[PDB]
Amino acid sequence: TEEFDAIKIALASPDMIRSWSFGEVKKPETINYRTFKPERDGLFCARIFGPVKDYECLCGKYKRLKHRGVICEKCGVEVTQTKVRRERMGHIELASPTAHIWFLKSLPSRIGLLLDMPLRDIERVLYFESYVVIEGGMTNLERQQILTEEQYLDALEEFGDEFDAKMGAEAIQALLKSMDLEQECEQLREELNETNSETKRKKLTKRIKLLEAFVQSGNKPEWMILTVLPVLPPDLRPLVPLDGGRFATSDLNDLYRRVINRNNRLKRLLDLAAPDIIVRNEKRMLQEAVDALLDNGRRGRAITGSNKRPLKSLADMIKGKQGRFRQNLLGKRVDYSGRSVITVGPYLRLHQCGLPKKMALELFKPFIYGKLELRGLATTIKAAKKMVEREEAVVWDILDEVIREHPVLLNRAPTLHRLGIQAFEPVLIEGKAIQLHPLVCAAYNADFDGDQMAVHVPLTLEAQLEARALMMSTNNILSPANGEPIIVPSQDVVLGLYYMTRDCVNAKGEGMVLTGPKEAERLYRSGLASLHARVKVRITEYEKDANGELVAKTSLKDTTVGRAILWMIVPKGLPYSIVNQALGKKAISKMLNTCYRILGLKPTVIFADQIMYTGFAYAARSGASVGIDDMVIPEKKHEIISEAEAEVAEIQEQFQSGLVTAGERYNKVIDIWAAANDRVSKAMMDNLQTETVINRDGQEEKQVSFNSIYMMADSGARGSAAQIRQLAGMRGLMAKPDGSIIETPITANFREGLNVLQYFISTHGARKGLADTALKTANSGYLTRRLVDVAQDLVVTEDDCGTHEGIMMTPVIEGGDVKEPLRDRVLGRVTAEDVLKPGTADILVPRNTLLHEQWCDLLEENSVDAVKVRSVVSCDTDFGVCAHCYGRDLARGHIINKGEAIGVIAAQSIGEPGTQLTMRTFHIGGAASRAAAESSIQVKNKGSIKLSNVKSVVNSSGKLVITSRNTELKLIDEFGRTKESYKVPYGAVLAKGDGEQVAGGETVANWDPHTMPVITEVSGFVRFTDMIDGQTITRQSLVVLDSAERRPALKIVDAQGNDVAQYFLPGKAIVQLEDGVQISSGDTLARIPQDITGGLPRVADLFEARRPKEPAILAEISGIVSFGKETKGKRRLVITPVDGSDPYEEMIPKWRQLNVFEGERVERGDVISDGPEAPHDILRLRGVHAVTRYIVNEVQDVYRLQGVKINDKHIEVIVRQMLRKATIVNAGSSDFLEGEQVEYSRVKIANRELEANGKVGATYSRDLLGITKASLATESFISAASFQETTRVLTEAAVAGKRDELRGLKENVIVGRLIPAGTGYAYHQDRMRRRAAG
């Protein structure tokens, strides 16, 4: 059959239903309960929907069904279209066509109702007491008015003959036929052009767009009123929610026979010519039966369901019973995939794992049946079923032929990212448990304690190709979210290579003049240990001095035995400086990283496998044990503890003095015991030296020890200092959720004997740390749920992006030292046509290139400041993305290909951090204060500095302070790269004069949060004001006045004998001087002091795009802006004078801060810094650039607090998905001041400027509403609102006449098709090419 690509839901024509099914139906004797035989014609029985049993008919004659297109006696002869069950439905004939209730009540009166008439009167005239007169004229009333019985009696008395008014929907049909749609649309466009009411605007735009949906839908709205209705199949019904019955005794049959019974009674009473009240009662009960059959007919809260009303609504069985979430949500028959306990397998190279015997004998049972049929060993199927039960040797031979080169999927139940399911190759393992590759544990995020993993068998050949082509563990070496390699050795291979490449002093064997090098043979025979001293062996090495070739060299180097054996592992000549050190997690991870960067993908997998093999084989020969001699006790420890408690006794004397309060004593106890913990940590680190030594004495270090705990602490794989200090020395403080701690912590360790109170208090740390695991799991799942629900309609569809404009890449960090360099951000993304040296007329790339490590080395050896990067949003692509800007796709090495699913990797990259942030970085104490001495703003790196947004304030001293709000510092490192983002406070006291530059030392700022830059530039005494009471009640030499409760700005005094600048209002102002005091310039006049990033709800606040607590009002193009600028009587800060008119005057409710003092002309895009910034105003005025930088840098400032690293490509993809709903200003062809799709707007602009028009429709503004309507902005009904009511969406997409047009990924999950991503997009393009080719 054909496929489903883009089909509208238009109204079913009566002619299409009469051509769908043809025949006559009378006397509904449908199902006889005592016969169970094929009866006559009826409605919804065995006579309709063809036969009830597969290939036969019981009609009396012609059971072969030669002809087609007749209903002879009791069976359906005509099929003519499809198979037996998927054929036509049937029809019912109504004497009075009733309207559909979903247009009459669209929750509430949304679509299918508006005709310049209220909902309540239309609901009243469809009842029995009122009606609407049609085809009137020559009177005072109109056709839109409502009438009662006496009013219609007076109307027929006055109007006389030719009066027409029907109780049913036929008068609505005649009124809808009489009203012209085009003339009504013209009148509503004229009313939109003439009227000015704001509530009228949205109503008229909804009316115009609905009538345009009716016009360009090409269909009659009178098809909304149901005249002939098809029925549904009886086996389409599921079972009842109560106990198990039959299909004929279901809940729908009573409502169906009620509707058919009222229809036949209407036919009989119209053939009998009943009076008016009887036929109106018949039409009323028929309309009530139709309205009860379609929906439940609820009006309000619906306080109680009427004793489980049987099938009240059709929408309830479409949405709830059958399930809108039908595919891939309940789980749906996993079908030869099962669970077992995961064990480790120390063999079977990376693209291989283990599988149990009695499980793999069962997993390939149809494959065993098929191969026994193919080889001719089993004649029948029962013979094969017996040969499986006998379990003889040839069955195991066939099973070995099955498992030999066949893939499989291993799939844990928490898959927070894509590497939770990985494809491998099964090998038979004796037992019932699964052996896994040892190094896949960080990608699985679980340890070997009995965790389970489903074993999905690829059943089709294409699934085998999907497993061996995309989902293997050898295909994915890097992580798909960071770029860090995911395969990392964990404490086995790490300890083996740490013991392998460990040096010693004066061991056996010295001066090894060797060739080959072959240092393992004398280790194996006699006289040589693997930890020997520096011997000179000959080590050959390959290099890449020739492009595409290998340059071999030969040199003798001083090394150890284990490094010489480790060089035999290394293929094709890696650089020697990475294996000439001690190997921990960092060193082995950097070795694997450089091996992946240099050798590619094929040597690094066998390199990692052979590193794992030699690490296992030499950690087995190591034999590290943890004994009582390994744990060491510091010899001064008790003394330190004594000193500690002595200091506590001194504080206790202060506790008897009366000079130290409770919190100060608590902080002193925390500081003293933390200093004692630091002293015992340094004493333990000194005592780890010289424990297990070789026979050598008199040296300085004296043979650094080989106990296991110092090897694990120095290796840094799992042994960290925070647990070695808890093993030996002092444990210190604990963690309590109440926020307090004891005043005499644990003095002993786990080497010595603890007290009962010490263990009783140390239990609280486990009580605090245990509750973190179960919490915030469902919230982290729901965040990823919404991020997929907002970003499922993006796939790669083209090849070239075709732009010159992109997001400018600037190196920015947090406060303090450097956090992320520029080279991590330049690597990846494809740059634009122009990158610049500081020398003129010098370029690097002609147009573009694939940025790998050689271009990073070229940019590292040269000087670069800013990199122009081709990127998102800008150069939008119709029906998807070209994604040429998406360069260097992670976990693979190649150029980007078409059909890659983008967006579902984004939510897995955002959702990959854990359940709760850990930013305490210490114990429960620490004495975290606001500021110890000062804020300490200075420069660290060399280079000249540049100050941004500063002034020239006249001062008496040599330094020049500033009074600005925003101040930035630019630093010269290579060619203008700053690499130092120091948060300068608003109006910081600068110790350096403005206009001078210096590099190295000379700290330019010294700010204290107690002052305020409100000074005088001209020397002179204070301006005399009036001192009145009432303004001295302000909060955080006396204060005189206050501008908040009413310091206002006055004229500055310019003379020492005469009583004669601009003073802004920060919100709090306290006068620190007296009127009439001789003061000089640059002195204290009046000083008093007065965004939020980080958190797991902060991520939700970022990706929901909610409005902050304090919104910001930006500045447009140039106009005269100054304090007051003709403010009104109330609601201050209204800017009326603007040069260049621009009639845009905003009204501020006086809550906001004073905006500007300097900058009498401004530009579109100036910052105002009114607390948090409003992203929608920056999107409307500045553009996509600052909003993208704002969201991406706030996401990175959230991520850097914990150390997790996620590339900005996924976040910018989510930002691209959140930039729909483009609202226009200039009216276009088919739109007027509304919001539509961005791609449709680009298509309309291209069709305007292409052939005929000059410019019709332009200057559109984007929206950043966030998560609510952007997830509902999918313009296909199959994933418009899947959670919400189904028929509510279906009615809107039926009247609107919208097309699906195949963009989306969850769309073909809800419907069920080949998804247009990966290899499915290849099948889509092959079908679209074979359709055009023939």
């Binding site: 693209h351 080169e405 066949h406 050949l461 294409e462 085998q464 190709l465 190649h894």
Partner: protein, 75 residues
């Protein structure tokens, strides 16, 4: 010969996504019948044979189109 990574087959035709459908439509004729493999089997399944036939650079879209027109003309 156990194939580790199909990337050397991607060097011939680089999409990573056409390779699955091309190998599938090549291997259906060898799985059903009426065709002979150009590469002898190394005691494996037809999947590894399809990966190695794409890796050697013998079968692409043009050869499949020519052989499809030849089988339609011969039938």
């Amino acid at each position: 010969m156990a194939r580790v990574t199909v990337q050397d087959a991607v060097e011939k035709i680089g999409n990573r996504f056409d390779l699955v459908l091309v190998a599938a439509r090549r291997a259906r004729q060898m799985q059903v019948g009426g065709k002979d493999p150009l590469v002898p089997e190394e005691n494996d399944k037809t999947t590894v044979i399809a990966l190695r036939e794409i890796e050697e650079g013998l079968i692409n879209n043009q050869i499949l189109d020519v052989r499809e027109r030849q089988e339609q003309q011969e039938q």
